[PDB]
């Protein structure tokens, strides 16, 4: 049922056909064989004669053309770009500990303790010297210190004021890089977008018109996008538009999938709703009910899809 | 112990304010309060200074159209969208 | 063709960028342990 | 008491010393990713001195850390010889021995105070160890258990540290009574 089954069984009315719907046995669109020249998916299996039309979202391209027949556009298009909708994590309950690292906090308390330490060794230990740094009392003038809360007491003696002004020094430094550290740490919407990066994983469907429309774009920022996308990994290549769909959503939007427009549009209306089109159409391009190159069912298939544009049987059906 | 309730209100208030200390806790539980707070204090105040660093550095929908009338709204007194609008099936 | 179509070309404070200062304090401490241990 | 002040003292200097030798010794300082014995990115325990591997072809293979693949190798050097985790259990040592020599020949008190500057320093000495391991690693990973042996250490001493100056302080005030 669909689209395509509902098309299929007007198409048949208006061409003038009696039809069985067959899935196309590689559950591909159609590409030359990067290799071995076999055309793959629904292209093949017209030009193989395996199959005498292809009422599918199968893209009108020169190679497809030249290799099947294909009626007039039933749908206008482009690639698009299908993102997971952001929902930036949200900041964890001890985020205020982001700004140092885990062993900076870890050593700042080991150094406040070793502080403390000798603060009262070198401030108690002397006979010579007989309130006054006690262990309590210096684990809190110690505290004190780095919270930059004042002092109540300071040390006296040379020994305890060099102690003293390092533990000082110590903490100005460490404490202004926090400050400055959470300052910066509280300081994609197209093709062009995405080629310009690479960490947001996008891909084409693995073989048909979307991979050989980068291969052969003569546009920079698709040639660019094209340029990583066939050395992404993970393999950003797709053999269905729900698996690259499934790639945008189970990605939390680190993957981005070119889809054409339609598929885009389609799957953004598909629960889980988790998913959004951004940047235009990568495209001018049209869907053809398409024949084996010659085949005499390709005149009825222009005709009828003529039909059902006069008529909207293609846009109701989409709608 | 001068820790009464007005010197606590003042003890607290001034170390919020990262100023002066004059008594500062001498128990072990006044000096845990007196820890957190300070604590308290310095994640808060670095948070609204860098914050500020960063404030100091860098009718909508046809719903709203149709649920105030503060902001009148009209069409070309003949034109398409008049006639979408005296047409439309969509009841905003 | 063979020049570009194929190019194949905020983080938190971590201990080595406040290291110095670590080092500088353990030494001061060290002095104050001689300067008390001499007097 | 005075009796328990030295059982504290002693236990805890046995078990500080014991944790730091123990950690020296075992290689659970760092679990990360990489290679139990070559000339391919598995997990390893990788110790102070040796790497080993966990989960493997050849898991079990322990091969030597290659410390060195002017700042740099003068920290690659205290590294590689790491002559201030060493330093600390030399430091521990004494402090023990010191504390144990406040029997025979008591009354002496100065030996107490030794103990005290030994266990404090070795304290520091740890620090400075813990800071030139976590940055020489450093140019995900997790921290063994010898590291928080190591760091347990650390606090113990530093705590056999107080208690021992204040023996110290203690001898001296009821001499002067
Ligand atoms: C701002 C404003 C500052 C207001 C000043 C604080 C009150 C001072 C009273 C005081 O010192 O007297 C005694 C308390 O006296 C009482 O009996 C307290 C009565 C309850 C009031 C508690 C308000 C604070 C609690 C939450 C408010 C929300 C104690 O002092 P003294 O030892 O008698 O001298
Ligand atoms: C009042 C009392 C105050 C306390 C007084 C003085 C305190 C000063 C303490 C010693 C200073 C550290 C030495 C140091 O930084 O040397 C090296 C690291 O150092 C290391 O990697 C060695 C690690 C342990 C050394 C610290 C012992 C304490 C770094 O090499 P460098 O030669 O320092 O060059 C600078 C680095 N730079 C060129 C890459 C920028
Ligand atoms: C009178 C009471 C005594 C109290 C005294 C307490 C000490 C306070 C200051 C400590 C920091 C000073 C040390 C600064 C070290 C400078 C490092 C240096 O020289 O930098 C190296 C080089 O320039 C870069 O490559
Ligand atoms: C002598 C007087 C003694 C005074 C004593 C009072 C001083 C308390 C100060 C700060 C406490 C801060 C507590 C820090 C807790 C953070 C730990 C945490 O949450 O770390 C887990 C992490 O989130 C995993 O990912
Ligand atoms: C002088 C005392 C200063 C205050 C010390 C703050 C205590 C910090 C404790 C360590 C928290 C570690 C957070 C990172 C944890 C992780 O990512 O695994």
């Not at chain 1, 039933?74 to 964890?92: A, D, E, R, T, Y």
């Not at chain 3, 179509?5 to 404070?13: P, Q």
């Not at chain 4, 730091?20 to 659970?28: L, P």
């Not at chain 4, 850390?65 to 740099?72: K, L, R, S, V």
Request: charged letters at 20%.
């Amino acid at each position: 049922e669909g689209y395509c089954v509902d098309l299929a069984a007007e198409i048949a009315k208006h061409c003038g056909f009696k039809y069985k719907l067959t899935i196309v046995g590689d559950g591909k669109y159609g590409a030359r064989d990067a290799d071995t020249k076999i055309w793959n998916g629904m292209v093949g299996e017209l030009v193989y004669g395996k199959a005498d039309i292809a009422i599918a979202p199968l893209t009108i391209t020169l190679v497809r053309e030249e290799v099947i027949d294909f009626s007039k556009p039933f749908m206008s298009l482009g690639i698009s770009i299908m993102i997971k909708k952001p929902q930036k994590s949200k900041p964890g309950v001890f985020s205020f500990l982001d700004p140092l690292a885990y062993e900076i906090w870890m050593c700042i308390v080991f150094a406040y303790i070793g502080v403390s330490v000798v603060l009262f060794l070198v401030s108690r230990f002397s006979p010579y010297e007989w309130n006054e740094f006690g262990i309590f009392n210096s684990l809190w003038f110690s505290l004190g210190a780095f919270m930059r809360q004042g002092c109540d007491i300071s040390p006296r003696s040379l020994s305890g004021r060099i102690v003293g002004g390092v533990w000082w020094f110590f903490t100005l430094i460490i404490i202004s890089s926090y400050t400055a550290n959470l300052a910066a740490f509280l300081t994609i919407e197209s093709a062009e977008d995405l080629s310009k990066q690479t960490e947001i994983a996008y891909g084409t469907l693995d073989s048909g018109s979307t991979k050989e429309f980068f291969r052969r774009s003569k546009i920079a920022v698709f040639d660019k996008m094209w340029t990583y996308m066939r050395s992404a990994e993970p393999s950003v290549f797709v053999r269905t538009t729900a698996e690259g769909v499934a790639r945008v959503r189970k990605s939390k939007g680190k993957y981005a999938y070119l889809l054409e427009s339609t598929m885009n549009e389609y799957i953004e209306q598909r629960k889980p709703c988790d998913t959004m089109k951004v940047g235009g159409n990568l495209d001018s391009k049209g869907y053809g009910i398409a024949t084996p190159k010659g085949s005499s069912l390709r005149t009825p298939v222009n005709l009828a899809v003529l039909k059902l544009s006069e008529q909207g049987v293609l846009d109701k059906l989409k709608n | 112990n001068e820790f009464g309730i007005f010197n606590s209100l003042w003890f607290s208030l001034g170390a919020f304010m990262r100023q002066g200390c004059d008594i500062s806790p001498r128990s072990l539980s006044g000096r845990i309060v007196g820890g957190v707070w300070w604590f308290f204090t310095l994640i808060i105040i670095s948070s609204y200074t860098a914050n500020l660093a960063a404030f100091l550095t860098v009718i909508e929908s046809a719903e709203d159209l149709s649920k105030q009338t503060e902001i009148a709204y009209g069409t070309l007194d003949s034109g398409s969208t008049k006639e979408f609008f005296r047409r439309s099936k969509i009841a905003v | 063709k063979w020049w570009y179509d194929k190019g194949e070309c905020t983080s938190a404070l971590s201990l080595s960028n406040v290291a110095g200062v670590f080092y500088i304090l353990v030494g001061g401490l060290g002095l104050a342990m001689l300067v008390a241990l001499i007097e | 008491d005075r009796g328990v002040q030295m059982l504290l003292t002693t236990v805890g200097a046995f078990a500080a010393f014991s944790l730091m030798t123990i950690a020296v010794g075992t290689d659970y300082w760092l679990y990360s990713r990489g290679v139990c014995k070559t000339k391919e990115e598995v997990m390893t325990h990788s110790g102070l001195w040796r790497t080993c591997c966990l989960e493997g072809n050849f898991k079990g293979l322990c091969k030597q850390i290659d410390h060195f693949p002017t700042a740099e190798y003068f920290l690659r050097a205290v590294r590689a010889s790491s002559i201030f985790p060493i330093l600390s259990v030399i430091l521990l040592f004494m402090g023990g021995l010191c504390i144990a020599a406040s029997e025979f020949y008591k009354t002496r008190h100065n030996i107490i105070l030794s103990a005290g500057i030994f266990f404090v320093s070795a304290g520091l000495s740890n620090i400075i160890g813990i800071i030139v391991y976590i940055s020489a690693n450093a140019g995900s990973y997790s921290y063994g258990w010898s590291f928080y042996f190591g760091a347990l250490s650390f606090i113990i001493a530093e705590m056999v540290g107080v208690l021992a100056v204040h023996m110290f302080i203690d001898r001296h005030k009821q001499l002067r009574a």
